[PDB]
Design a protein around this ligand. Sequence first.
Ligand SMILES: CC(C)(COP(=O)(O)OP(=O)(O)OC[C@H]1O[C@@H](n2cnc3c(N)ncnc32)[C@H](O)[C@@H]1OP(=O)(O)O)[C@@H](O)C(=O)NCCC(=O)NCCS
Ligand SMILES: CC(C)(COP(=O)(O)OP(=O)(O)OC[C@H]1O[C@@H](n2cnc3c(N)ncnc32)[C@H](O)[C@@H]1OP(=O)(O)O)[C@@H](O)C(=O)NCCC(=O)NCCS
Ligand SMILES: CC(C)(COP(=O)(O)OP(=O)(O)OC[C@H]1O[C@@H](n2cnc3c(N)ncnc32)[C@H](O)[C@@H]1OP(=O)(O)O)[C@@H](O)C(=O)NCCC(=O)NCCS
Ligand SMILES: CC(C)(COP(=O)(O)OP(=O)(O)OC[C@H]1O[C@@H](n2cnc3c(N)ncnc32)[C@H](O)[C@@H]1OP(=O)(O)O)[C@@H](O)C(=O)NCCC(=O)NCCS
Ligand SMILES: CC(C)(COP(=O)(O)OP(=O)(O)OC[C@H]1O[C@@H](n2cnc3c(N)ncnc32)[C@H](O)[C@@H]1OP(=O)(O)O)[C@@H](O)C(=O)NCCC(=O)NCCS
Ligand SMILES: CC(C)(COP(=O)(O)OP(=O)(O)OC[C@H]1O[C@@H](n2cnc3c(N)ncnc32)[C@H](O)[C@@H]1OP(=O)(O)O)[C@@H](O)C(=O)NCCC(=O)NCCS
Ligand SMILES: CC(C)(COP(=O)(O)OP(=O)(O)OC[C@H]1O[C@@H](n2cnc3c(N)ncnc32)[C@H](O)[C@@H]1OP(=O)(O)O)[C@@H](O)C(=O)NCCC(=O)NCCS
Ligand SMILES: CC(C)(COP(=O)(O)OP(=O)(O)OC[C@H]1O[C@@H](n2cnc3c(N)ncnc32)[C@H](O)[C@@H]1OP(=O)(O)O)[C@@H](O)C(=O)NCCC(=O)NCCS
Lengths: 189, 189, 189, 189, 189, 189, 189, 189
Amino acid sequence: DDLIVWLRGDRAGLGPFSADLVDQYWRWEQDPSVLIGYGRQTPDSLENRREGYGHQARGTDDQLRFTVYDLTGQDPVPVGTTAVLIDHHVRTGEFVIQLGAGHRGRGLGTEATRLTLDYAFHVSALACVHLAVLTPNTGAIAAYERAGFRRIGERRDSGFWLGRRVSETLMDAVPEDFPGPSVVRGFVE
Amino acid sequence: DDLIVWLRGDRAGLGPFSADLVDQYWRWEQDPSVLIGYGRQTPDSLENRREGYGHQARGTDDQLRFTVYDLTGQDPVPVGTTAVLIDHHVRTGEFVIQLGAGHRGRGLGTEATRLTLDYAFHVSALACVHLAVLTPNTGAIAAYERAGFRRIGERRDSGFWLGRRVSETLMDAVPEDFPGPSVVRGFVE
Amino acid sequence: DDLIVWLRGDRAGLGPFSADLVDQYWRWEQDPSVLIGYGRQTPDSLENRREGYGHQARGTDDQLRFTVYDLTGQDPVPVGTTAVLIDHHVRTGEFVIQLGAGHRGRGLGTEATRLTLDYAFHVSALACVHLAVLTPNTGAIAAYERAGFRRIGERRDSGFWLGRRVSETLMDAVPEDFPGPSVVRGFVE
Amino acid sequence: DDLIVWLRGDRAGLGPFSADLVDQYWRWEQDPSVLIGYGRQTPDSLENRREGYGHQARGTDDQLRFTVYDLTGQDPVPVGTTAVLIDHHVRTGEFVIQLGAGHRGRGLGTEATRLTLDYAFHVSALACVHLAVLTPNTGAIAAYERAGFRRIGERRDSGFWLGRRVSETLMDAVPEDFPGPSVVRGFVE
Amino acid sequence: DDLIVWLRGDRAGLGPFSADLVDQYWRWEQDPSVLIGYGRQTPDSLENRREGYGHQARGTDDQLRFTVYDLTGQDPVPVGTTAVLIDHHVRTGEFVIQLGAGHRGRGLGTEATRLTLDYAFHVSALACVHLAVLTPNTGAIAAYERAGFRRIGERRDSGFWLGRRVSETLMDAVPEDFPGPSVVRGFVE
Amino acid sequence: DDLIVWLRGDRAGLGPFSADLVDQYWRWEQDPSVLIGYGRQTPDSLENRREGYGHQARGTDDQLRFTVYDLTGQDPVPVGTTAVLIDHHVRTGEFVIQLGAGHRGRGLGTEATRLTLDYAFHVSALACVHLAVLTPNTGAIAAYERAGFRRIGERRDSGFWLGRRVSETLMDAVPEDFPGPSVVRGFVE
Amino acid sequence: DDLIVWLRGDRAGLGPFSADLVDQYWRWEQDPSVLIGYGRQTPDSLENRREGYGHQARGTDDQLRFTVYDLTGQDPVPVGTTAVLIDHHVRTGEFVIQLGAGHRGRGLGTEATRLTLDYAFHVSALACVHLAVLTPNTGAIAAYERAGFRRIGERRDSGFWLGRRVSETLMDAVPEDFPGPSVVRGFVE
Amino acid sequence: DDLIVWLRGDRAGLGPFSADLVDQYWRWEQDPSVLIGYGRQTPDSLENRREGYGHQARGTDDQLRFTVYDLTGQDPVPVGTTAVLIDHHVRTGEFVIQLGAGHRGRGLGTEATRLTLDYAFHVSALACVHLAVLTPNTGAIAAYERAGFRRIGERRDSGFWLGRRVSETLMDAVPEDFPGPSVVRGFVE
Ligand SMILES: CC(C)(COP(=O)(O)OP(=O)(O)OC[C@H]1O[C@@H](n2cnc3c(N)ncnc32)[C@H](O)[C@@H]1OP(=O)(O)O)[C@@H](O)C(=O)NCCC(=O)NCCS
Ligand SMILES: CC(C)(COP(=O)(O)OP(=O)(O)OC[C@H]1O[C@@H](n2cnc3c(N)ncnc32)[C@H](O)[C@@H]1OP(=O)(O)O)[C@@H](O)C(=O)NCCC(=O)NCCS
Ligand SMILES: CC(C)(COP(=O)(O)OP(=O)(O)OC[C@H]1O[C@@H](n2cnc3c(N)ncnc32)[C@H](O)[C@@H]1OP(=O)(O)O)[C@@H](O)C(=O)NCCC(=O)NCCS
Ligand SMILES: CC(C)(COP(=O)(O)OP(=O)(O)OC[C@H]1O[C@@H](n2cnc3c(N)ncnc32)[C@H](O)[C@@H]1OP(=O)(O)O)[C@@H](O)C(=O)NCCC(=O)NCCS
Ligand SMILES: CC(C)(COP(=O)(O)OP(=O)(O)OC[C@H]1O[C@@H](n2cnc3c(N)ncnc32)[C@H](O)[C@@H]1OP(=O)(O)O)[C@@H](O)C(=O)NCCC(=O)NCCS
Ligand SMILES: CC(C)(COP(=O)(O)OP(=O)(O)OC[C@H]1O[C@@H](n2cnc3c(N)ncnc32)[C@H](O)[C@@H]1OP(=O)(O)O)[C@@H](O)C(=O)NCCC(=O)NCCS
Ligand SMILES: CC(C)(COP(=O)(O)OP(=O)(O)OC[C@H]1O[C@@H](n2cnc3c(N)ncnc32)[C@H](O)[C@@H]1OP(=O)(O)O)[C@@H](O)C(=O)NCCC(=O)NCCS
Ligand SMILES: CC(C)(COP(=O)(O)OP(=O)(O)OC[C@H]1O[C@@H](n2cnc3c(N)ncnc32)[C@H](O)[C@@H]1OP(=O)(O)O)[C@@H](O)C(=O)NCCC(=O)NCCS
């Protein structure tokens, strides 16, 4: 009961950024695969993450942070994190997502991104959600495309993939391109 | 016995803004339906709510905060929150209200608003209580109309409803339009 | 040359909220006519205004503050102040204006409000600008109507006019109702 | 002699971010045309700019800030500002530029951007310099294209132009696409 | 389960710089053999190491710190430490390593250095990793040579070995000289 | 008379790190040629240099800082800076040097480096002075070789020269290889 | 196991300056015989020693502090303290030693001093270790002579022995005069 | 008249440690000859000397500091500094002295040391004054011998002279060996 779930999809759900899962968030973010995908170069310390959780918690006016839950089992189980950095001046946000090592390839990322887009479009009233992802990360490309993102173009020589200089793909999503039924509309109506 | 009830209606009651219910207030305020109704775009953190409860508690000179109780059962059970921001210079206040997910549609909001208006008119000696509510939120419109509010007009293009730009309805209430018997008069006489 | 003018109309102009005019802003705001029009009940001190100017200056992210200049003479002369409190979440702002004692009735308020609306619509990208003004203040009503505001309704018994309890008129403006040519478009094109 | 010039082109030059020009930087940045081009919605105060200059000055490890000088006259005259926010992890930077009201259309922006790219490529050893510019700002598009930037794509509905929701064009530059002779190579060889 | 292992080789593995092992890190670093190999002259205190662990933990932006685990047994057991001081301006890092007294001569240092080089090359995207080691320390020379380092030269009379003034050997490693399969590539692909 | 000269060579001399020349030190260090030679990527601010001069001045226990004077004229004139970072544990130091734009190619760097080596060897009692210099900087190579440095080797791919990844040459100097007469011996005997 | 032993001789050993033995260090240092031998005139308080232990612990860059253990029994037992104050500028140190009341005359002081000299010569790379000891303290003279110290001379009238003004003997030790096998060499080879 | 002289000899005199001569004290102490004689390895900064003068001034309970004056001219002229660090527990002090570059070889050091010894013996009631001086510094040896110091012995390999490891001579002085008439006795009798 301690795990609150706000949006419930068919396969995944979103909840608050609970403080009981700071260690799990650290362990998820420190995985080498996540570091390669994000492009971060150095591991962060658990103490620094614990200290930074408070500053993340106070600064929630222009920041969306959700815990992704797997709803296929009897009870929800946290599997990843989604975040949107909101620029209230232009109604746009920047989207990031990561899942656990054992929860990838089961589809959860697609519905997690779709639910995050639903929340950003129908609750935060954002006009555009965009992201930057390294080109070789084709799985993330497919997940974002099926979630509702569209390709903008390639920013040449602005990232590293296994030490090699590669471009990154810029993608964006708009409310009129949002696929599937919206859970938020079910909440309102 | 810890749950103090000040005003007792037929279906609902009002009590103090207890500190034992900060987590419940957070959970009520973080519901997607409440966020859509209020028009808030980003969820707030539990730690920030716990920290802000103190600043709410000290600043009570020009702020009314009540906990709504359901009195249909054997014991009172908290179901929502009401608040009035008082401007002592002109004897006016701004009214907000929200109930829990499982307590809506049973009428409790109407008597909660009526009791809050009774307290504001006959204890706080306010000359006018007003609110701003999004136009598509028709249930709140009906609740406020039956509670004693009257429609002023529509403020064009000043809010978002499921990402769509919509107007909001401005409403006000005056003591001479207060319906039904007053509990405060029973307290005094 | 020290008086910077950003927007230049036919009769009036807008400039920055200069620190060399804090005493003049105080003297303008302390006039009994301005106190009656705004509805403020107690005079403010010059020292408090000087201290508060800094806090006004730092907090400019969601606040527009202009100095109104009379351009009918050879050189610009400050005659009043305009301000818009911006709510970036919904792209709306609240508008206030006051002129000097000897500068009223010459029309400067109308073009000052029109230029402020032009700046808010075409630079700040606001979807709605609204204000609250006491009903007996008919001159301000006419100025706002000719500037581009439209009447919403009357909020009953929410203000004092010469000690008498009176209602206040709520007005709003939208970009599609903006009259006349836009100076900002001339700046861009 | 107080105006130091580091890079000297045929028409323009770059110098340090002098503290004697904080007021001029403020006046340049506060022009309505610059606000429209950047997409900033509210004017900043002179006191806030003076206070922020120090924090800009200390934080120079990952920030390039230049003053653009017009070298067509007998002595250099400052006309604008260029800045590159450097991300040392991936050797990329984000580029912004603005000129004075009376210095546009004379070509100075093109050589200013070219010299900034030369400095970033041959001194800062950046692999990619990118920018985001509103689509209707066609003059900036042409200036960046002739300076050495290439179009990536359009980010839909992520900015405002005169109150209208418009897309912004993403551009990038790479060392192998740098046009013209390099001044830095003349410095080294 | 508390011992997290990120990279797993055939004989050794790398994990985070856990706070539960500060005393063990102190005891490893205070061994006379480690002091002779590093060239440190005075022992450090346990209290100073405990205090300094926090400052090490916060400063992780340009610092890699791993705990070396022996994977030959049933469960991982910490045996040493590896560290890389990263200079993000030139994509280079300085490498140090030490093992426990009872864990030397079993080969663990070679694979520990190889895995650290793999992490630095394919996750941190470093172009060169270098170290300085005293010339008489021939075992470390052989370990670094088999791990992937190449000899640069000897810096004359810049260190002490058992009180005698000796030179130190400078070594470096580049991605194109990295031997063996890469674990990070297995993580990505 | 304010310019103190400690060591006097035939062409150049060394003096204290005077506080009257902080602006000149800034201007010398900010030259693009000096930035290319050192490998620094971003310019530093004058205010930051003025603030950092104090911290340089207090920390003089393990730091040598000299002002290079040209003694060919009637009076000494400052032309550059030399610095040695001393590691008292092993009696070694790291050497850097830069001259002004108009003072290069006249030989002053060679005698400045020779006098700095004389001071480090015969006053600081250092056993080895070493430096790291980019390979394409052949003029500095020749200056260091004639001053008394000897080549150690090349550290592959650890620096940038005009945006190109290049190696840097490591050099060292020992007292027994010090050329020419020593001024310090003339001081003592 | 809590008692760490670094250097192990035939009769005595050296370990870290443990914080669990602050009271024992106080009791050893407060003995009247130790006060007479050192020449200290007033007893120190236990609280002051406990407070000063921290400042001793942080300041370990130029300070060697060991706990002397008696290794003749089954388990090591602390019997005294040795300390060397290191002057890194000239590679020299000042040596002091004291043992417990019941541990003197068994030879432990000789091997404790010899092991401290071994550590200072072969780990700290000190060129000279010196001490000052009162002339009537003949037992300490013999211990230092057999440990490896040589007599320099007598400093006339610079100390008190039982209230009588006496001279003190100055002694020094050099690496080439170090007797017996070195444990540190066994550690290295 | 500002130059106070306490003890007046035939050729030299002693005065207070005036604050008007901090720059002159710095310049005297920074001379390469003084650095070689004392054995200091790095120059000190003028700002650090100015800051440290205050801490020298407050701490005068166990510190004698004099300014040496040349009395051969019409008016006293400062030529050097003498200092005695007093250990009040044993009535002993450590003596240092330095003169200006142009004031050596005229004998002033001998009478300066003699007057300092007179002050220490007959005013401070010290039983022994000692010093440590490098062996090759034969001029200081002769000056101390004629002043009243006697040789104790040589501390082997504890100092550097022009980079060469040399011994230092230890000397002491006692009241019964004080030569010549005492000025302090003339003051008292
Ligand atoms: C990308 C990531 C965040 C999650 O996205 P994702 O879950 O992998 O993307 P998907 O949801 O499409 O994975 C679903 C896979 O299951 C398959 N699948 C399809 N239908 C399915 C179903 N009904 N049930 C189960 N699996 C299904 C899909 O084909 C897909 O394989 P594919 O993506 O190669 O086409 C995760 O891979 C990750 O943690 N990456 C590391 C961090 C990172 O890269 N972040 C992004 C940086 S911007
Ligand atoms: C609006 C809100 C705060 C509570 O008001 P409310 O309880 O829904 O309004 P009501 O009391 O009229 O709901 C009573 C319903 O029960 C019905 N009802 C009538 N008589 C009843 C009775 N005797 N017993 C039970 N139910 C009855 C009413 O017809 C009404 O349906 P209707 O409102 O559609 O006409 C709640 O809906 C809510 O939490 N909204 C989200 C937050 C929010 O919107 N706040 C306002 C923003 S300004
Ligand atoms: C309202 C106020 C801010 C300025 O607005 P304003 O300048 O008075 O409104 P106007 O510009 O229409 O005054 C112009 C008058 O000149 C007349 N006029 C018309 N054309 C004109 C022209 N070409 N040239 C000169 N005068 C002209 C107009 O008829 C108008 O009279 P009217 O307003 O009664 O119809 C000023 O009156 C004031 O300082 N009030 C006190 C503070 C206050 O009330 N603030 C508002 C609280 S919300
Ligand atoms: C864009 C800006 C920063 C400077 O760039 P710019 O100087 O206008 O771009 P240019 O250098 O090409 O202007 C040169 C003009 O002179 C013309 N020109 C060509 N050759 C010329 C020559 N030899 N001499 C003089 N003029 C010449 C060019 O055709 C060009 O006209 P065009 O740009 O429409 O084709 C300036 O317009 C500005 O301040 N904008 C507001 C702030 C802003 O928009 N910043 C960018 C937000 S990302
Ligand atoms: C150097 C040090 C850090 C670890 O490196 P290392 O483990 O000793 O180097 P190695 O891995 O090659 O030791 C493996 C030995 O086992 C032998 N070996 C070879 N194959 C083996 C196998 N399959 N299984 C077991 N042992 C094997 C090797 O021949 C080697 O002996 P050698 O190094 O003399 O040739 C460790 O010695 C140490 O702690 N030193 C003190 C601190 C220090 O010196 N740090 C470096 C300062 S820069
Ligand atoms: C390198 C630097 C610091 C000064 O060193 P330098 O003065 O250039 O080296 P030199 O003293 O040899 O220059 C003397 C030149 O004059 C010539 N020369 C020879 N004899 C001469 C004489 N008697 N009189 C005048 N000139 C003479 C030499 O041939 C030499 O040319 P060369 O160096 O190409 O062979 C300066 O070039 C500089 O500021 N560089 C930028 C910063 C930098 O690179 N620092 C080093 C980074 S580690
Ligand atoms: C001096 C002191 C620190 C320890 O040094 P020490 O142990 O007394 O000196 P020793 O090791 O030689 O004592 C060993 C004695 O055992 C005898 N001995 C010789 N061989 C022995 C053996 N194999 N086994 C046992 N005893 C032996 C020695 O003859 C010696 O007697 P001696 O010193 O009079 O010749 C201790 O006496 C002490 O605590 N003094 C008070 C503090 C102090 O004075 N500090 C020094 C101020 S600088
Ligand atoms: C040592 C020092 C502090 C001053 O001492 P000093 O003045 O040189 O020693 P003196 O007074 O003997 O110099 C007098 C010289 O004049 C000669 N002299 C003798 N009688 C003389 C007279 N009547 N008139 C003039 N000169 C005379 C002496 O023979 C002597 O030469 P000598 O010392 O080689 O024999 C000074 O040399 C100095 O500044 N040294 C650098 C700092 C330093 O070394 N400090 C000591 C470190 S512990």
